[PDB]
Design goal:
It is classed as transferase. The structure is a homodimer of 208-residue chains. Chain A is α/β, with parallel strands linked by helices. Chain A has one domain: Rossmann fold (3-Layer(aba) Sandwich), CATH 3.40.50.300. Chain A has 9 helices and 5 strands. Chain A has helices spanning 13-26, 43-52, 63-75, 78-85, 97-107, 115-127, 143-156, 169-185, 200-207, and strands spanning 2-6, 31-35, 90-94, 135-139, 190-194. Chain A has a 5-stranded parallel sheet with strand order 2-3-1-4-5, sandwiched between helices. The longest helix of chain A has 17 residues, at 169-185. The radius of gyration of chain A is 16 Å and the shape is globular. At the A-B interface, α2, α3 and α6 of A face α2, α3 and α6 of B. The complex binds thymidine-5'-diphosphate (2 copies) and magnesium ion (2 copies). One thymidine-5'-diphosphate binds at residues 9, 36-37, 49, 70, 95, 99-100, 103, 163, 165-166 of chain B.
Amino acid sequence: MLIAIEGVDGAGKRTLVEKLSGAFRAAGRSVATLAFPRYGQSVAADIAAEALHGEHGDLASSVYAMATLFALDRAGAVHTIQGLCRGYDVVILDRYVASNAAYSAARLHENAAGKAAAWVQRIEFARLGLPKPDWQVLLAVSAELAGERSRGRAQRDPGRARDNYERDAELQQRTGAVYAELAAQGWGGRWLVVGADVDPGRLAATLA
Amino acid sequence: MLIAIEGVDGAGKRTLVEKLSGAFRAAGRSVATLAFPRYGQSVAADIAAEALHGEHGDLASSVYAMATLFALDRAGAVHTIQGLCRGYDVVILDRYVASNAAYSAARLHENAAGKAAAWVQRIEFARLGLPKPDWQVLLAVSAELAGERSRGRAQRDPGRARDNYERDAELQQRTGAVYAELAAQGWGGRWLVVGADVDPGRLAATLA
Ligand SMILES: Cc1cn([C@H]2C[C@H](O)[C@@H](COP(=O)(O)OP(=O)(O)O)O2)c(=O)[nH]c1=O
Ligand SMILES: Cc1cn([C@H]2C[C@H](O)[C@@H](COP(=O)(O)OP(=O)(O)O)O2)c(=O)[nH]c1=O
Ligand SMILES: [Mg+2]
Ligand SMILES: [Mg+2]
């Protein structure tokens, strides 16, 4: 079973992945996890992050260039994802294809039924062959709270300074809205919308 | 021995690669060839070409995004290039790293001592580990003649319509100028500047 955890920056995805993995293991299922971007394992991922931190000229100014880099990162992980799914009962991803649809649409002020989301579908699922997730869990959080979390992280960790997207409050808001739309239409597969107070035990029961 | 053939669009590079390979083989040396972009073998290469033909939103509008895609294409060919060099006496490339420096600098109206060329050096040779060529041969041709060749190709081949770069006469001119500068400074290694009337036999003798 392939599960992807989605949400804006500072929504609490990493923590949910930890809690969910614990819940699945408590139920006797083997679990494997993978997070995108795969910094260090993909040149595309590293360049993307660096661009969001002010490097690489005009790269970050292009919505499709950034989306392409994240897609190329996932493209290189197809084998890994396929291998993990045939080796573990559950594979949980911290961000997946929907992140690209949500952020790209939001940067262009488009909705989930727009051009960017459709492009992501065509490129990542059809062309690159990335498997569609059995479940996509949207960790919906107030834009204000998520932004506060991102800022707090930068304050206590010199290695966690915010990037161009995280510093854009309006972008984060629009991204949360597109995510809600993607979930409602079942973009890429079935979705579940949860809050910061979701019970890991029952969530795992719903997914497993 | 690693040799890269460089020059603007329609300079006659493909033909020179053929003639040069023939000359080397006539001298008893084994020869292998590779052309960049590696269309069909790299998702990055294909997306780059498609972007230059009007697809993928705002991707082509970013100079660094395009350069990154071509660099990612070559990155995936490192093993191949290394394998070919230890298996053949001569390895000839139709375009290599210098193409990225020349076109990127030209799109930004920079010279060979500019920011873009230095970025290409840092990213492709140092970071990605691409081997520096023993020789880089610049097939210098009049901007007018090269442009005429590109146009003629599109006229007789429906599968060879010109792209965004080829349609930009001024860009092609500036690119030729940056190439001349790169050769004069020995950017990335030793260069040889030849014309359309260069003798394949003697050129091979100089290189081999
Ligand atoms: C994985 C992914 C991330 N992004 C965005 C969301 C984030 O702002 C940013 C990087 O992802 P994120 O997981 O936030 O990484 P970091 O720890 O570096 O903050 O890029 C996309 O636009 N598309 C994608 O496919
Ligand atoms: C290989 C390469 C090409 N280019 C440019 C030169 C050409 O205009 C274009 C594509 O290369 P080209 O060899 O002309 O391919 P095609 O047969 O599709 O015309 O992109 C770069 O800017 N950087 C690179 O590294
Ligand atoms: Mg982030
Ligand atoms: Mg061309």
